[PDB]
Amino acid sequence: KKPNIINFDTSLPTSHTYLGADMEEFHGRTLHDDDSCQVIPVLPQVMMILIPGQTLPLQLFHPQEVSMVRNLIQKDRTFAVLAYSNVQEREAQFGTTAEIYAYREEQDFGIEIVKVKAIGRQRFKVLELRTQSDGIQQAKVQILPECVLPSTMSAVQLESLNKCQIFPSKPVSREDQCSYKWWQKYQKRKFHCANLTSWPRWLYSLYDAETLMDRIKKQLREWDENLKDDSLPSNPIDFSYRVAACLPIDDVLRIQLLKIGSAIQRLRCELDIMNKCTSLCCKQCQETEITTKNEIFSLSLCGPMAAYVNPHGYVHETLTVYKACNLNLIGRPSTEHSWFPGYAWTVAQCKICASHIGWKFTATKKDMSPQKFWGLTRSALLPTIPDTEDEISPDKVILCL
Protein backbone atom coordinates (compact mmCIF):
# COMPACT_ATOMS: atom_id res chain seq x y z
CA LYS A 1 0.00 0.00 0.00
CA LYS A 2 0.99 3.66 -0.63
CA PRO A 3 0.42 6.03 2.32
CA ASN A 4 2.04 9.34 3.39
CA ILE A 5 5.65 9.80 4.58
CA ILE A 6 5.82 13.56 5.12
CA ASN A 7 5.74 15.60 8.34
CA PHE A 8 7.43 14.37 11.54
CA ASP A 9 11.28 14.27 11.57
CA THR A 10 13.12 10.94 11.25
CA SER A 11 15.92 12.24 13.49
CA LEU A 12 13.73 12.47 16.63
CA PRO A 13 13.79 8.79 17.62
CA THR A 14 17.54 8.29 16.85
CA SER A 15 18.34 10.85 19.56
CA HIS A 16 16.19 8.96 22.12
CA THR A 17 14.89 12.17 23.64
CA TYR A 18 12.80 10.23 26.14
CA LEU A 19 15.91 9.62 28.29
CA GLY A 20 16.14 13.26 29.35
CA ALA A 21 18.87 15.88 29.60
CA ASP A 22 21.93 15.57 27.41
CA MET A 23 24.33 12.93 28.66
CA GLU A 24 28.09 12.99 29.17
CA GLU A 25 29.38 11.64 25.86
CA PHE A 26 32.61 9.79 25.27
CA HIS A 27 34.51 9.67 21.97
CA GLY A 28 37.61 7.52 22.74
CA ARG A 29 36.98 4.14 21.07
CA THR A 30 38.47 0.69 21.56
CA LEU A 31 38.90 -2.40 19.36
CA HIS A 32 40.93 -5.50 20.13
CA ASP A 33 42.91 -7.68 17.76
CA ASP A 34 41.20 -10.51 15.90
CA ASP A 35 41.34 -13.99 17.50
CA SER A 36 42.63 -12.33 20.69
CA CYS A 37 41.56 -13.56 24.08
CA GLN A 38 39.79 -11.04 26.34
CA VAL A 39 38.06 -11.12 29.74
CA ILE A 40 34.91 -9.05 29.72
CA PRO A 41 32.00 -8.64 32.14
CA VAL A 42 28.40 -9.60 31.18
CA LEU A 43 25.10 -7.75 31.71
CA PRO A 44 22.55 -10.14 33.22
CA GLN A 45 19.08 -9.11 32.15
CA VAL A 46 20.03 -8.26 28.56
CA MET A 47 17.75 -10.65 26.68
CA MET A 48 18.66 -8.94 23.40
CA ILE A 49 20.90 -10.41 20.69
CA LEU A 50 23.12 -7.48 19.69
CA ILE A 51 24.47 -6.76 16.21
CA PRO A 52 27.68 -4.80 15.52
CA GLY A 53 26.76 -1.19 14.79
CA GLN A 54 23.38 -1.38 16.52
CA THR A 55 22.44 1.32 19.03
CA LEU A 56 21.36 0.11 22.44
CA PRO A 57 19.75 2.21 25.20
CA LEU A 58 19.69 0.97 28.80
CA GLN A 59 18.25 2.08 32.14
CA LEU A 60 19.84 0.23 35.06
CA PHE A 61 18.51 0.09 38.59
CA HIS A 62 20.30 -2.70 40.47
CA PRO A 63 23.24 -1.50 42.60
CA GLN A 64 25.63 -4.08 41.07
CA GLU A 65 24.91 -2.87 37.58
CA VAL A 66 25.50 0.74 38.65
CA SER A 67 28.80 -0.24 40.32
CA MET A 68 30.06 -2.09 37.25
CA VAL A 69 29.11 0.97 35.13
CA ARG A 70 31.00 3.30 37.45
CA ASN A 71 34.07 1.03 37.19
CA LEU A 72 33.84 0.98 33.40
CA ILE A 73 33.31 4.75 32.93
CA GLN A 74 36.99 5.35 33.80
CA LYS A 75 38.36 2.27 31.99
CA ASP A 76 37.54 1.15 28.41
CA ARG A 77 33.73 1.52 28.69
CA THR A 78 33.27 -1.87 27.03
CA PHE A 79 31.18 -4.86 28.14
CA ALA A 80 29.66 -8.01 26.61
CA VAL A 81 26.16 -9.12 25.57
CA LEU A 82 25.35 -12.81 25.41
CA ALA A 83 23.22 -14.19 22.65
CA TYR A 84 20.83 -16.33 24.68
CA SER A 85 19.80 -19.18 22.43
CA ASN A 86 17.77 -20.93 25.18
CA VAL A 87 16.62 -18.20 27.58
CA GLN A 88 15.34 -20.81 30.05
CA GLU A 89 18.75 -22.48 30.61
CA ARG A 90 20.65 -19.16 30.08
CA GLU A 91 22.70 -20.90 27.37
CA ALA A 92 24.90 -18.77 25.12
CA GLN A 93 27.73 -19.87 22.80
CA PHE A 94 28.23 -16.53 20.99
CA GLY A 95 27.88 -12.85 21.76
CA THR A 96 28.68 -9.26 20.86
CA THR A 97 30.73 -6.55 22.55
CA ALA A 98 29.19 -3.18 23.37
CA GLU A 99 30.83 0.20 23.95
CA ILE A 100 29.27 2.98 26.01
CA TYR A 101 29.01 6.33 24.21
CA ALA A 102 26.65 8.27 26.53
CA TYR A 103 26.17 8.24 30.28
CA ARG A 104 24.18 9.99 32.99
CA GLU A 105 23.48 9.11 36.65
CA GLU A 106 20.44 10.31 38.57
CA GLN A 107 19.81 10.07 42.33
CA ASP A 108 16.35 11.71 41.95
CA PHE A 109 13.22 10.55 43.76
CA GLY A 110 15.31 8.46 46.17
CA ILE A 111 16.46 5.78 43.70
CA GLU A 112 19.85 5.08 42.08
CA ILE A 113 19.13 5.31 38.35
CA VAL A 114 21.72 5.17 35.58
CA LYS A 115 21.04 5.89 31.90
CA VAL A 116 23.44 4.58 29.25
CA LYS A 117 23.66 4.55 25.44
CA ALA A 118 25.97 1.99 23.90
CA ILE A 119 26.83 0.60 20.45
CA GLY A 120 27.85 -2.74 19.07
CA ARG A 121 31.43 -3.35 17.97
CA GLN A 122 32.78 -6.88 17.61
CA ARG A 123 31.40 -10.38 17.38
CA PHE A 124 32.82 -13.10 19.57
CA LYS A 125 32.70 -16.80 20.47
CA VAL A 126 32.48 -17.83 24.13
CA LEU A 127 35.36 -19.86 25.57
CA GLU A 128 34.68 -19.90 29.33
CA LEU A 129 32.38 -18.27 31.92
CA ARG A 130 33.24 -17.51 35.54
CA THR A 131 31.24 -15.85 38.30
CA GLN A 132 32.76 -13.57 40.94
CA SER A 133 31.46 -13.28 44.57
CA ASP A 134 29.77 -9.92 43.92
CA GLY A 135 27.38 -11.46 41.32
CA ILE A 136 28.88 -9.80 38.23
CA GLN A 137 30.05 -12.60 35.95
CA GLN A 138 33.14 -12.58 33.71
CA ALA A 139 33.66 -14.21 30.34
CA LYS A 140 36.87 -15.48 28.68
CA VAL A 141 36.10 -14.75 25.05
CA GLN A 142 37.75 -15.06 21.64
CA ILE A 143 37.22 -12.27 19.10
CA LEU A 144 35.74 -13.57 15.87
CA PRO A 145 37.53 -12.42 12.72
CA GLU A 146 35.89 -10.70 9.81
CA CYS A 147 36.77 -12.86 6.79
CA VAL A 148 36.92 -10.78 3.61
CA LEU A 149 37.75 -12.10 0.22
CA PRO A 150 39.02 -10.61 -3.03
CA SER A 151 36.88 -10.53 -6.15
CA THR A 152 36.16 -13.94 -7.67
CA MET A 153 37.96 -12.83 -10.82
CA SER A 154 41.27 -12.08 -9.10
CA ALA A 155 42.49 -15.66 -9.60
CA VAL A 156 41.44 -16.15 -13.22
CA GLN A 157 41.82 -12.56 -14.38
CA LEU A 158 43.94 -12.44 -17.51
CA GLU A 159 46.94 -10.13 -17.41
CA SER A 160 46.11 -8.37 -20.64
CA LEU A 161 42.68 -7.36 -19.30
CA ASN A 162 43.91 -6.19 -15.87
CA LYS A 163 44.14 -2.71 -17.42
CA CYS A 164 40.87 -0.86 -17.57
CA GLN A 165 39.40 -3.26 -14.93
CA ILE A 166 38.64 0.21 -13.45
CA PHE A 167 35.49 1.92 -14.84
CA PRO A 168 35.40 5.48 -16.16
CA SER A 169 33.55 8.18 -14.13
CA LYS A 170 32.92 5.64 -11.41
CA PRO A 171 29.36 6.46 -10.29
CA VAL A 172 26.11 6.39 -12.19
CA SER A 173 23.90 9.45 -12.46
CA ARG A 174 21.60 7.92 -9.75
CA GLU A 175 18.94 7.25 -12.51
CA ASP A 176 18.38 3.49 -12.94
CA GLN A 177 17.91 3.52 -16.78
CA CYS A 178 21.48 4.90 -17.24
CA SER A 179 22.29 2.45 -14.39
CA TYR A 180 20.71 -0.60 -16.11
CA LYS A 181 22.98 0.12 -19.12
CA TRP A 182 25.83 0.63 -16.61
CA TRP A 183 25.15 -2.67 -14.79
CA GLN A 184 25.06 -4.59 -18.06
CA LYS A 185 28.37 -3.02 -19.18
CA TYR A 186 29.75 -3.68 -15.65
CA GLN A 187 28.80 -7.35 -15.84
CA LYS A 188 30.21 -7.84 -19.32
CA ARG A 189 33.51 -6.19 -18.36
CA LYS A 190 34.23 -7.18 -14.77
CA PHE A 191 33.17 -10.79 -15.28
CA HIS A 192 34.50 -11.28 -18.79
CA CYS A 193 37.11 -13.86 -17.69
CA ALA A 194 34.19 -15.89 -16.31
CA ASN A 195 34.24 -17.57 -19.72
CA LEU A 196 37.36 -19.40 -18.52
CA THR A 197 35.57 -21.21 -15.70
CA SER A 198 32.78 -23.78 -15.30
CA TRP A 199 30.11 -21.14 -14.72
CA PRO A 200 28.70 -18.04 -16.44
CA ARG A 201 28.72 -14.35 -15.53
CA TRP A 202 25.27 -14.11 -14.02
CA LEU A 203 26.25 -16.70 -11.40
CA TYR A 204 29.25 -14.69 -10.15
CA SER A 205 27.15 -11.54 -10.22
CA LEU A 206 25.16 -13.14 -7.37
CA TYR A 207 28.37 -13.25 -5.27
CA ASP A 208 29.54 -9.67 -5.99
CA ALA A 209 29.35 -7.21 -3.13
CA GLU A 210 28.42 -4.28 -5.42
CA THR A 211 25.49 -6.05 -7.04
CA LEU A 212 24.18 -7.32 -3.74
CA MET A 213 24.41 -3.85 -2.18
CA ASP A 214 22.54 -2.33 -5.15
CA ARG A 215 19.73 -4.86 -4.91
CA ILE A 216 19.50 -4.20 -1.18
CA LYS A 217 19.39 -0.45 -1.88
CA LYS A 218 16.50 -1.07 -4.29
CA GLN A 219 14.66 -2.98 -1.53
CA LEU A 220 15.36 -0.24 1.02
CA ARG A 221 14.13 2.66 -1.11
CA GLU A 222 10.84 0.77 -1.36
CA TRP A 223 10.41 1.30 2.41
CA ASP A 224 11.36 4.96 2.59
CA GLU A 225 11.83 7.62 -0.06
CA ASN A 226 13.93 9.96 2.12
CA LEU A 227 16.96 7.78 1.29
CA LYS A 228 20.15 9.02 -0.28
CA ASP A 229 23.01 6.79 -1.30
CA ASP A 230 25.17 8.90 1.04
CA SER A 231 23.30 7.86 4.19
CA LEU A 232 24.26 4.20 3.78
CA PRO A 233 27.88 3.10 4.34
CA SER A 234 29.89 2.01 1.30
CA ASN A 235 31.85 -0.67 3.18
CA PRO A 236 30.13 -4.00 2.53
CA ILE A 237 30.90 -5.23 6.04
CA ASP A 238 29.37 -2.26 7.85
CA PHE A 239 26.63 -2.18 5.21
CA SER A 240 25.76 -5.81 5.87
CA TYR A 241 25.70 -5.33 9.64
CA ARG A 242 23.50 -2.29 9.28
CA VAL A 243 21.05 -4.11 7.02
CA ALA A 244 20.85 -7.06 9.37
CA ALA A 245 20.34 -4.89 12.43
CA CYS A 246 16.96 -3.65 11.16
CA LEU A 247 15.51 -6.84 9.68
CA PRO A 248 12.73 -8.36 11.79
CA ILE A 249 13.65 -11.96 12.52
CA ASP A 250 13.34 -14.53 15.28
CA ASP A 251 16.12 -15.27 17.67
CA VAL A 252 17.29 -18.52 16.15
CA LEU A 253 17.68 -16.97 12.70
CA ARG A 254 19.39 -13.91 14.19
CA ILE A 255 21.94 -16.23 15.92
CA GLN A 256 22.52 -18.03 12.62
CA LEU A 257 23.09 -14.79 10.73
CA LEU A 258 25.52 -13.53 13.32
CA LYS A 259 27.55 -16.77 13.03
CA ILE A 260 28.37 -15.80 9.43
CA GLY A 261 31.96 -14.68 8.92
CA SER A 262 31.97 -13.29 5.37
CA ALA A 263 30.03 -10.20 4.44
CA ILE A 264 29.12 -11.71 1.05
CA GLN A 265 27.21 -14.56 2.71
CA ARG A 266 25.58 -12.14 5.13
CA LEU A 267 24.28 -9.98 2.26
CA ARG A 268 23.11 -13.02 0.32
CA CYS A 269 21.14 -14.19 3.35
CA GLU A 270 19.62 -10.80 3.85
CA LEU A 271 18.40 -10.54 0.24
CA ASP A 272 17.04 -14.04 0.42
CA ILE A 273 15.07 -13.26 3.57
CA MET A 274 13.75 -10.01 2.15
CA ASN A 275 12.41 -11.92 -0.85
CA LYS A 276 11.13 -14.99 1.06
CA CYS A 277 9.29 -13.85 4.17
CA THR A 278 6.39 -11.71 2.96
CA SER A 279 4.20 -12.40 6.02
CA LEU A 280 4.58 -11.54 9.69
CA CYS A 281 2.43 -13.51 12.15
CA CYS A 282 2.17 -13.93 15.90
CA LYS A 283 5.10 -15.79 17.40
CA GLN A 284 2.94 -17.44 20.03
CA CYS A 285 0.03 -18.38 17.75
CA GLN A 286 2.07 -18.90 14.59
CA GLU A 287 -1.19 -18.86 12.58
CA THR A 288 -2.46 -15.33 13.33
CA GLU A 289 -1.37 -12.96 10.58
CA ILE A 290 -0.38 -9.53 11.87
CA THR A 291 1.02 -7.80 8.77
CA THR A 292 3.13 -7.97 5.55
CA LYS A 293 6.34 -6.34 4.29
CA ASN A 294 4.23 -4.11 2.04
CA GLU A 295 3.27 -2.24 5.22
CA ILE A 296 6.86 -1.81 6.38
CA PHE A 297 8.35 1.68 6.34
CA SER A 298 11.25 3.53 7.95
CA LEU A 299 10.14 6.08 10.56
CA SER A 300 13.79 6.52 11.79
CA LEU A 301 17.15 7.36 10.18
CA CYS A 302 18.59 3.90 10.88
CA GLY A 303 15.71 1.90 9.48
CA PRO A 304 12.28 0.47 10.16
CA MET A 305 13.34 -1.56 13.21
CA ALA A 306 15.48 -0.51 16.12
CA ALA A 307 15.99 -1.11 19.81
CA TYR A 308 14.38 1.25 22.33
CA VAL A 309 14.39 1.22 26.15
CA ASN A 310 11.37 1.51 28.43
CA PRO A 311 10.81 3.02 31.86
CA HIS A 312 11.58 -0.33 33.55
CA GLY A 313 14.85 -1.14 31.74
CA TYR A 314 13.35 -3.57 29.18
CA VAL A 315 14.59 -3.31 25.61
CA HIS A 316 12.25 -3.67 22.63
CA GLU A 317 13.49 -4.25 19.08
CA THR A 318 10.46 -2.39 17.76
CA LEU A 319 9.37 -2.18 14.12
CA THR A 320 7.37 0.69 12.60
CA VAL A 321 4.53 -0.32 10.24
CA TYR A 322 1.53 1.44 8.73
CA LYS A 323 -1.22 -1.17 9.15
CA ALA A 324 -1.85 -4.12 11.45
CA CYS A 325 -4.81 -6.33 12.29
CA ASN A 326 -6.14 -9.03 14.65
CA LEU A 327 -5.31 -6.87 17.64
CA ASN A 328 -7.35 -5.64 20.62
CA LEU A 329 -6.21 -2.46 22.35
CA ILE A 330 -5.69 -2.36 26.14
CA GLY A 331 -5.94 0.82 28.19
CA ARG A 332 -6.04 4.35 26.86
CA PRO A 333 -3.43 6.22 24.80
CA SER A 334 -0.52 7.80 26.65
CA THR A 335 2.52 9.91 25.86
CA GLU A 336 4.38 8.72 28.99
CA HIS A 337 8.00 8.06 27.99
CA SER A 338 7.06 7.86 24.29
CA TRP A 339 9.86 6.91 21.85
CA PHE A 340 8.32 8.94 19.01
CA PRO A 341 7.69 12.51 20.21
CA GLY A 342 4.25 13.76 19.18
CA TYR A 343 2.53 10.38 19.39
CA ALA A 344 0.62 8.51 22.13
CA TRP A 345 0.90 4.73 22.53
CA THR A 346 -1.73 2.07 23.35
CA VAL A 347 -0.88 -1.53 24.32
CA ALA A 348 -1.85 -4.08 21.65
CA GLN A 349 -2.66 -7.75 22.29
CA CYS A 350 -3.45 -10.62 20.01
CA LYS A 351 -7.19 -11.16 19.99
CA ILE A 352 -6.65 -14.96 20.12
CA CYS A 353 -3.84 -15.81 22.55
CA ALA A 354 -3.80 -12.43 24.39
CA SER A 355 -0.07 -12.04 23.93
CA HIS A 356 1.46 -8.57 23.81
CA ILE A 357 2.45 -7.62 20.26
CA GLY A 358 3.33 -3.93 20.58
CA TRP A 359 1.72 -0.51 20.69
CA LYS A 360 -0.49 1.79 18.62
CA PHE A 361 0.97 5.29 18.20
CA THR A 362 -1.62 7.99 17.69
CA ALA A 363 -0.73 11.58 16.75
CA THR A 364 -1.39 14.30 19.30
CA LYS A 365 -1.78 17.05 16.68
CA LYS A 366 -4.14 16.89 13.69
CA ASP A 367 -1.59 18.35 11.25
CA MET A 368 0.80 15.43 11.76
CA SER A 369 1.07 12.78 9.06
CA PRO A 370 0.72 9.84 9.43
CA GLN A 371 -1.98 10.26 12.07
CA LYS A 372 -1.38 6.74 13.43
CA PHE A 373 1.01 3.84 13.07
CA TRP A 374 2.09 0.62 14.80
CA GLY A 375 5.16 -0.43 16.73
CA LEU A 376 5.60 -4.19 16.99
CA THR A 377 8.15 -5.81 19.28
CA ARG A 378 10.45 -8.29 17.43
CA SER A 379 10.42 -10.82 20.25
CA ALA A 380 6.62 -11.23 19.73
CA LEU A 381 6.57 -11.61 15.92
CA LEU A 382 7.34 -14.51 13.53
CA PRO A 383 8.35 -14.12 9.88
CA THR A 384 6.39 -16.48 7.67
CA ILE A 385 7.22 -17.60 4.14
CA PRO A 386 4.24 -17.50 1.77
CA ASP A 387 2.50 -20.82 1.41
CA THR A 388 0.89 -21.52 -1.99
CA GLU A 389 3.29 -22.36 -5.00
CA ASP A 390 0.67 -24.74 -6.38
CA GLU A 391 0.62 -26.17 -2.79
CA ILE A 392 2.33 -29.36 -4.25
CA SER A 393 5.68 -28.11 -2.71
CA PRO A 394 5.38 -26.81 0.89
CA ASP A 395 8.11 -25.65 3.35
CA LYS A 396 9.08 -24.61 6.91
CA VAL A 397 10.73 -21.58 8.63
CA ILE A 398 14.37 -21.84 7.56
CA LEU A 399 17.14 -19.35 6.66
CA CYS A 400 18.24 -19.86 3.11
CA LEU A 401 21.65 -18.56 1.97
Partner: peptide, 30 residues
Protein backbone atom coordinates in the same frame (compact mmCIF):
# COMPACT_ATOMS: atom_id res chain seq x y z
CA UNK B 1 -8.23 4.02 46.05
CA UNK B 2 -6.50 1.00 44.57
CA UNK B 3 -5.48 2.48 41.21
CA UNK B 4 -4.94 0.23 38.18
CA UNK B 5 -2.05 -2.23 37.98
CA UNK B 6 0.24 -2.29 34.96
CA UNK B 7 2.91 -4.65 33.66
CA UNK B 8 6.51 -3.60 33.69
CA UNK B 9 7.33 -5.44 30.46
CA UNK B 10 4.86 -3.78 28.13
CA UNK B 11 2.75 -1.37 30.20
CA UNK B 12 -0.30 -3.64 30.00
CA UNK B 13 -2.80 -2.06 32.37
CA UNK B 14 -5.28 -4.34 34.29
CA UNK B 15 -7.50 -4.47 37.37
CA UNK B 16 -7.76 -7.59 39.60
CA UNK B 17 -4.52 -8.86 41.16
CA UNK B 18 -3.81 -12.19 39.51
CA UNK B 19 -4.98 -11.10 36.03
CA UNK B 20 -1.68 -9.34 35.45
CA UNK B 21 0.05 -12.40 36.98
CA UNK B 22 -1.55 -14.33 34.16
CA UNK B 23 -0.56 -11.72 31.59
CA UNK B 24 3.11 -11.65 32.73
CA UNK B 25 3.22 -15.49 32.52
CA UNK B 26 2.66 -15.06 28.76
CA UNK B 27 5.88 -12.99 28.29
CA UNK B 28 8.91 -14.93 29.49
CA UNK B 29 7.16 -18.29 28.73
CA UNK B 30 8.35 -19.31 25.19
Amino acid sequence: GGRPLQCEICGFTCRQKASLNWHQRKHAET
